[PDB]
Subunit: 281 residues, 3 copies
Amino acid sequence: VVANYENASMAADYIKRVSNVLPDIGIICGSGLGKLIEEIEERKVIPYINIPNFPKTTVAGHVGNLVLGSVGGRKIVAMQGRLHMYEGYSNQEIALPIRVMKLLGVRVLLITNLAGGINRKLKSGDFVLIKGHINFPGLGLNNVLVGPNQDEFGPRFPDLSNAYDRLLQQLALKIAQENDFQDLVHEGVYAFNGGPTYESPDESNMLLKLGCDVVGMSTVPEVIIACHCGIKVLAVSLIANNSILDAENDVSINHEKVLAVAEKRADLLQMWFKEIITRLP
Amino acid sequence: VVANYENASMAADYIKRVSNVLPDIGIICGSGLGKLIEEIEERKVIPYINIPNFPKTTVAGHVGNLVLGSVGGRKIVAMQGRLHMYEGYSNQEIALPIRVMKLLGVRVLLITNLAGGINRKLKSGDFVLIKGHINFPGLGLNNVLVGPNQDEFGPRFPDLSNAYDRLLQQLALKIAQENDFQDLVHEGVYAFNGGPTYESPDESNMLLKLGCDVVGMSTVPEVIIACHCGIKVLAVSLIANNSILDAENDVSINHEKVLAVAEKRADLLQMWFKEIITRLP
Amino acid sequence: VVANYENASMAADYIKRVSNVLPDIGIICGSGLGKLIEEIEERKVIPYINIPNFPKTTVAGHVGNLVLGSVGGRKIVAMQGRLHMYEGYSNQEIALPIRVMKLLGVRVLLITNLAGGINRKLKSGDFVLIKGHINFPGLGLNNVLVGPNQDEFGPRFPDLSNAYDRLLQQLALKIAQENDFQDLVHEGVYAFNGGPTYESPDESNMLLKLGCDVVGMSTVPEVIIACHCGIKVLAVSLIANNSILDAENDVSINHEKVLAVAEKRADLLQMWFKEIITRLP
Ligand SMILES: Clc1ccc(C2=CSC3=NCCN23)cc1
Ligand SMILES: Clc1ccc(C2=CSC3=NCCN23)cc1
Ligand SMILES: Clc1ccc(C2=CSC3=NCCN23)cc1
């Protein structure tokens, strides 16, 4: 199924019939970072399998729901169960849920992910406000927009220079300062590694030479689809490890260590994003 | 349809029956840079849709013609309507028209494109004679030659060290000096960004570190297919903007600004390439 | 056909019925470097076309056999006729023979390849023990593991930091010292160029900046599939040329020069790997 105007419209019509919520804000949460979705007020849960034209996610399994409701007095829509390109999903499958958000009225998209640290200042448990990216799949002819352009949504050749909104970054930092955890918050450039193997030690050393601060396997495809159709983005990485220190010391990484860092920071991240939602313009 | 010897032969046979021209020179022109095609003498226009085994271009639409005729007393064939890989065309679709040129007798291919400047010496409106390239799709398993080798056309493992002919570069520069616009002409290395998003600010900074002078979304696939089958190439970029200055100043880019630069330089480029065609060995 | 547990099991069952060999060691040899396979004792030759679920290799042609038998008193299985991703084989086709090795009992995989030298210390005819890699296809969403994870074989997110076993590297070096050819043996980082074009002169200069020692078009996909399922790896490059010197001097390369270097070093490499097999733990 193509992520075109007709197919996105059919999905949006179903959601409006079931939900009664017109959301202004969309959220996509990283693994182990989804507690906020469970606290959405007056919520409505819509399994992806119920929605016309949503991608099929049964080969990978696990949860897959849209959740609509209220947080801090604002109307929101969340993806619970994220689609990643290393799983084999196509460009069209990644893009269709974001374009449905657009048709439902979303103007701001908030995103979190787990990432490896490249900048020497970064420690396990730190946060990075993403200010730009290096898209290795895009340079190499696997951009999420390869294919015919869907002109109803945006232009053939988008400019990404303002993909990461400056004022949203400033608001996130302001809340951290108000609550005395600004020492955990950095800004940086995110490198997209298609995955699913972690960056090798010598790949990490290369990324340090090229001016990357963090590296991960998500986020950039959704940012590009949002920017193409005029949705503002805030994206925050939680640092699982420093890959440069690990390379210099011959130390390993695994999904278990990543998820333990996620559990340590989950409650703070939930509170931070609730406050951002409450206050964003 | 595969870009093999039998399929290219059927297309070439049709063209020879309709056209009566055996061309020595092929041209592919960048967007807004096609005026020369409209001045071809004794011309014959052959829509792609009429030619056996030519790729289907109706999803993207717009013009798609082969034009044969004379320029400066030389016999030429032009592609009017270029195929780009960010549109979703396959390796085989890009390659078949160049291999048909080979079977028609083409020995030299002249190419223009619009590009972003990375080298700090480059200004909007400058020209760059391409002397080499950095092929990010090729390094990343999306080379135009991935697939079975078509042995009738060239070798399994081509060498690209002489893909950009030195004497053709010298002749282009000589004509610029004769007519007092050599101050606009540079030489440089072209980075292939698969696209269709413009290079991000942080991607531009990376390309500066890696020794690239210009960046764009075309040209390298056609150069590789031509080199594989023994066709000499001259490739010239028109600089739409300096992406490094734009990153340092927080300034944006769009297809409209690009096309305005193309209109400013269109007549000079037409005259330059007419003179190159007249004089090349 | 997917490289899953059921499909690999059917292939392994056929091989055990025909062969009577349970191998501990697997080998994959570079082009012109396969003499050792011809010296396997008490050997059994099984064409790929005879084995359930093995990939179809008739479009490319040439040899394609599994060979089982004894070398130096150890039980081995060799791939005679290597599958390369520049030929158009999919992720699943590359992976299935390595996963069949796993099910047959292989614990160690030995690999050779032909490569271009980037480090200035490297000369034609030198050997490089690979200690790490830079996987441009992997960074760019063409990793061999893109797709559903086959959980019976390994984890969703593998760590590659110990993909190249340290003790196997030490043993290879020890044998070279015992026989007075250690002056030919280096260690280094391997860059994977998807191919099939040789690295361009300006790509070679980029790889020098990024800390690569050698560049080639194979090996990394098989290393990743082996590491994912717990097989230890030794990988050795034979240097055909120095691509940096060739770029500075305007000198070319071709498959013929590569194969002449292979013929010069073939007998030494056969003797070296026979001794490694005899002595590895
Ligand atoms: Cl991350 C964060 C965000 C907000 C607070 C806070 C201090 S007072 C108060 N009334 C409701 C929220 N709130 C603390 C931490
Ligand atoms: Cl780009 C260019 C190329 C040629 C000329 C020129 C000066 S005299 C003359 N007779 C015909 C062409 N021609 C000027 C500019
Ligand atoms: Cl590459 C290599 C490997 C081994 C030797 C060697 C010296 S004595 C001896 N008995 C059998 C093998 N062998 C020489 C060269």
